Design a binder for this molecule. Sequence first.
Ligand SMILES: O=C(NCc1ccc(S(=O)(=O)C2CCN(C3CCOCC3)CC2)cc1)n1cc2ccncc2c1
Ligand SMILES: O=C(NCc1ccc(S(=O)(=O)C2CCN(C3CCOCC3)CC2)cc1)n1cc2ccncc2c1
Lengths: 471, 469
Amino acid sequence: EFNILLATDSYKVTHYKQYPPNTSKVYSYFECREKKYEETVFYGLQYILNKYLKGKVVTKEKIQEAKDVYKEHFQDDVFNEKGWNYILEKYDGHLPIEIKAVPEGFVIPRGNVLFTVENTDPECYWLTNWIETILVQSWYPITVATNSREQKKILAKYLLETSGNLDGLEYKLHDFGYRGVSSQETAGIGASAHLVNFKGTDTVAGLALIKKYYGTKDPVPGYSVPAAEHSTITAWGKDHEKDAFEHIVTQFSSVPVSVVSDSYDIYNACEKIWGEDLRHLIVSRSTQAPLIIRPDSGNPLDTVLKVLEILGKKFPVTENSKGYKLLPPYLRVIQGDGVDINTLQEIVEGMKQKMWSIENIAFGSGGGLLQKLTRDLLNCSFKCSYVVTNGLGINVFKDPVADPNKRSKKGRLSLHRTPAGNFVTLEEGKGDLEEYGQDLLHTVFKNGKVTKSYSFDEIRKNAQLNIELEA
Amino acid sequence: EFNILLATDSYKVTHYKQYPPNTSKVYSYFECREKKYEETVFYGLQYILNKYLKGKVVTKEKIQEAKDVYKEHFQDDVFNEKGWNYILEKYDGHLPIEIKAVPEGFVIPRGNVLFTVENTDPECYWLTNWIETILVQSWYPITVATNSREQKKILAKYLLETSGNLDGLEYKLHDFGYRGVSSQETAGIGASAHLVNFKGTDTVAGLALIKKYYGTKDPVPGYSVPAAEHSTITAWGKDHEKDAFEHIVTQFSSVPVSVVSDSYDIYNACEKIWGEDLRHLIVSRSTQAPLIIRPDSGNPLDTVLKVLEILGKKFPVTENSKGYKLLPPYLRVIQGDGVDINTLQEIVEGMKQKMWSIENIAFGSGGGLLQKLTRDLLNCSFKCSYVVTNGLGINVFKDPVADPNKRSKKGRLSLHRTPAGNFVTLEEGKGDLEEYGQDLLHTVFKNGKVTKSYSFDEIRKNAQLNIEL
Ligand SMILES: O=C(NCc1ccc(S(=O)(=O)C2CCN(C3CCOCC3)CC2)cc1)n1cc2ccncc2c1
Ligand SMILES: O=C(NCc1ccc(S(=O)(=O)C2CCN(C3CCOCC3)CC2)cc1)n1cc2ccncc2c1
């Protein structure tokens, strides 16, 4: 059983005693602070609201559990039992909090308010920042979605340049990250964030999350194809790599199949096994059922180029309408080793320089896609900007002398369209002057209820690339 | 609920069709592959075994659910319903798998077998590697525990050099990482791994995991103290920082209290507010209840040194028996911004050069401790090393031409003590020759039951530093 009273940084347990006496309101906001990721995809808050924040989250038992834990953890009695009992008694354990947020899937420049949080009962001034820790974890799906979308931009540029269209773009970056993330929960969240931009995943945990919390018109949001791993090749024995390849492509003769080909010698596998011994089994396959050769070691760019050169000499290559080389439709490659946003760029650029179409390749990314990311990448941060004490509203902020990048926003915030159609965040309650039209934030949570939500299909639409929008 | 049939990489669903015909056994192993970080702390498997692998993990409903999902996911019917049905009917949904592992807390050099996995029923040859994905996630608590321990070694060396002892070492690196990790589950796992080495955490989720899966003689494995955040200072208004500080230290007058002091001007706060206006509230505090000043911005080394320099001129500093400067016992500092293993080393070395004892300082680390880590750091990896096909055992491995670092081990494996007291992994079933004493791997899981468990106290004992011993 999850217990929201035990789901905060320890020190926050002591904060109710630290605010100015007679504080009735604490108002805080989240942004990806400006400091190259100029825009972020807002995604993942809906998961958190539904799984952790909504409904009766306080019970008599949960209060007692927290009291008992904090008594030992602090070696002292500092826990606000009275405050949590008030919520239990007055609101039947529902949080007296209002959260306003930008729509999920929205692409917003850095340094804008993405969501705000405030207490709706003056007794619960302390509650706004109690939940900072859980809400700040939204950094992760935001950052995965954003970084995934940035790779989609690279892929789109090079696919458009080398082929003249964006066909298959949404299958060009496949999630390999299930084993390489830190937990089952993280796998579901991160995989779901990648699926904002793409349709290919092996991280099955993502499907159930999307189905439960977001929803799609389609049966599933993401897809895969049969494929080998090293164990299904090496199990045949070192001298029988060819027998393994033959068995596998024959088992999957009518659907696409990927076969990892570097167990012993990738160049030999491509040139002699696929290119000669088993060539008859490849050239006979359907366009809907290609063999996808998967190298998995060595320098990613050099290995990709070498594999393409080998296959290009063993199989009939054509030249597409843009003048780039194209493998026959029954044969493709996937590079799924050492892929992150930097190496992805290096590979597609290297392919372009060697006149190979990006149509030839897909990418699998694991740790690079889902794990090698931190809160510091987009500077996702939650800060108090407004309080009411003794009935007087005060605009509050931090502004550290040695780091202007850490300066926080002041006062009540709102998000607006500028006359040129861009976003701007108004501070100090200035949105009230109505010089910039309506606040674009929507109330998504109020007093224990989720009040606005988005389907996964709408989130995908919101997160589209401009170039996809053109077409 | 959680469904083990849906907790694997998609492609593994199709592997049962790909192994050699007449394969009755697939045996696989996990190591932190060799390519600093020369030794790893083995920790976290017990959590995975209990939460996900033990007991009745297959039901009719879970089989049907998986069948439905994979039909849409692959746009094809490739799922091994018959295989999962067999486990359900024959073993009441318990996994016919045996796992042998080195004891948790053990500190083992890179490139050694840490655990092995094999099927116990020939029909379930495909199951060994089905659960690779979930078992490989053990990389995370292993890596957190290892990286946390490496920081403990740095702290230990500098604390010993500058103070002559290791008093308080176990409170010198505090977990600040709750908000900076990717999920609630990750928070609990990562925090528990840090607690293998230290006793200070704000990541409360770690305590419940330890209580549920491991257990301690003490009521809790980790502790904290009251402390401010920027919001509890800034809420008073920019002109009232002093009022905020006064209120907070007075509220927590007889326990340790940490106060973030960089909301507007850290140097002013130390020199004028703490150092003059409120000095009388600081010098009256108990040794058991110090003020801990917390800078939180700027170059971490430069800021730590400047803060110490300021405090050193406003408060009575002593020189310890090693010749290093020491703040009075009612006053300490914690640096909790931008701390990772590299910057930690930079700070303590910089302090030593400026003749400041490491006694003066503690470190808080968040993303650096629990999030800025990947499976590539220790090359945690799971590979098949032995199969039985047509009744014959075959030693198998990968050995990619362009990367010798990715070569895997061959055959049945065992872990042993060398004559010199080090570790060695024997390959090709050579452990059976009994020339290297007893196998250090113990059966921890067999046919759906956890067969050997460790308390958190035992794990801590196993993971102790030599210098502590
Ligand atoms: O091979 C793996 N998974 C299956 C897979 C293979 C290839 C593609 S793809 O991206 O090449 C994909 C092919 C199918 N085509 C189309 C061909 C025409 O028909 C429609 C699909 C789209 C493009 C997508 C999925 N894995 C999962 C891993 C996890 C961790 N480590 C290693 C792993 C290896
Ligand atoms: O202040 C915070 N937590 C409380 C805390 C403060 C100081 C220490 S400490 O490590 O300085 C600790 C002091 C008490 N001493 C005792 C030594 C023996 O004598 C009594 C004091 C040990 C050494 C430990 C815990 N946080 C949590 C955060 C999470 C995310 N971002 C920022 C955060 C700020």
